[PDB]
Structure formats: C-alpha cells, structure tokens
Amino acid sequence: GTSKLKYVLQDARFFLIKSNNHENVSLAKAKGVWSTLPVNEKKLNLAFRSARSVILIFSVRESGKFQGFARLSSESHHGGSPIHWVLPLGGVFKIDWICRRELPFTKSAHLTNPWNEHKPVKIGRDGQEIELECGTQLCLLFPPDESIDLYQVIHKM
C-alpha cells in the first residue's frame, strides 16, 4: 500500500540530488550513504534538525530519469569508512532508501516546483529544494518498491 509512505512524507522536506554518474548512485544504494558539496551539506544539516523527514530524490545527469529516493537518518559526519566515489567534499550522511526503482521524467511533466520558478520538477541544480506538495506528489509517482519495509523508518522519526 501507500499509507506508511504517506506517513513518512507528512510534513517532510524534499531536495533534488543530481549525480554525474550512475556509479555514485549505485554506491549510495548499496551502502546507504550520501555526500555532497559543503554548500548543500549545510542546507541538509539545517533541514535535518528542523523536519520530521528530509527526503533526497536522486537523478543521474543525462539519464532522463530519477533513480529513487531516500530519507536522511543522520546529519553529516566525518571520519567514517571512506567511500570511493567517482568524482568530477563534506561529511557523510546516512540514508535509508524508501524506493530504489526508477521514474522517467516523462511521468513527472505535470509537476512544477514553486521554489524553482515553477519549472518542471526534473529541472534544478544539485541541492534544489522541492516544495512540499510537489515533492509529495513526485514521490507518490514512483513505482512501489515491495522490497522495502517502512516500519523501521517510521520508528526513527
């Protein structure tokens, strides 16, 4: 169903994450981690303290798709196990995946983001915030990921 998903997204904040390659998203999906440039790191840390859920929605540049979405489970921290990103960096955020399935941009064409001049939600720099209603509807468009159990995510809220 979609009910636990809606509960997790209630009053969440949403951020568009743009990755230059698939390898980094694959690493994030396998290890449950993300890292971003300091300007976005500071914004995500502020959001994590201020909201019940902070949701990252991932898109690989040139792919024409989103690759899934995840919820922050920590602020950024240094000194952990190093991650061999493919680089073109601040701390590491732990994340719990909510959906690991892809969504083509063709299916999000009816959603515009008020915080980016009402451009289609697919358009945005890495770290662009997505307004609550746009972000909720975007997450609800993804195919259901029946491999994930949101019971444990709910307990971290």
Side-chain angles (χ1 to χ4, degrees), residues 117-124 126-132 134-148:
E117 311 184 1
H118 287 87
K119 295 175 177 188
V121 64
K122 70 175 181 183
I123 304 302
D126 189 25
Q128 168 74 56
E129 189 164 1
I130 304 168
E131 178 272 332
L132 169 66
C134 184
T136 302
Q137 288 319 304
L138 176 54
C139 288
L140 290 174
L141 285 176
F142 281 78
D145 190 340
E146 292 152 27
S147 75
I148 282 166

Side-chain angles (χ1 to χ4, degrees), residues 42-51 53-60:
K42 284 178 191 75
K43 289 151 33 153
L44 289 183
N45 278 333
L46 276 164
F48 181 81
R49 306 153 184 152
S50 83
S53 283
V54 180
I55 303 296
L56 306 190
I57 308 170
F58 290 81
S59 177
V60 173

Side-chain angles (χ1 to χ4, degrees), residues 27-28 30 32-35 76-85 89-93:
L27 271 173
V33 289
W34 192 245
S35 197
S76 67
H77 294 295
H78 293 274
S81 322
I83 302 145
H84 301 116
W85 305 112
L89 191 45
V92 168
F93 294 90

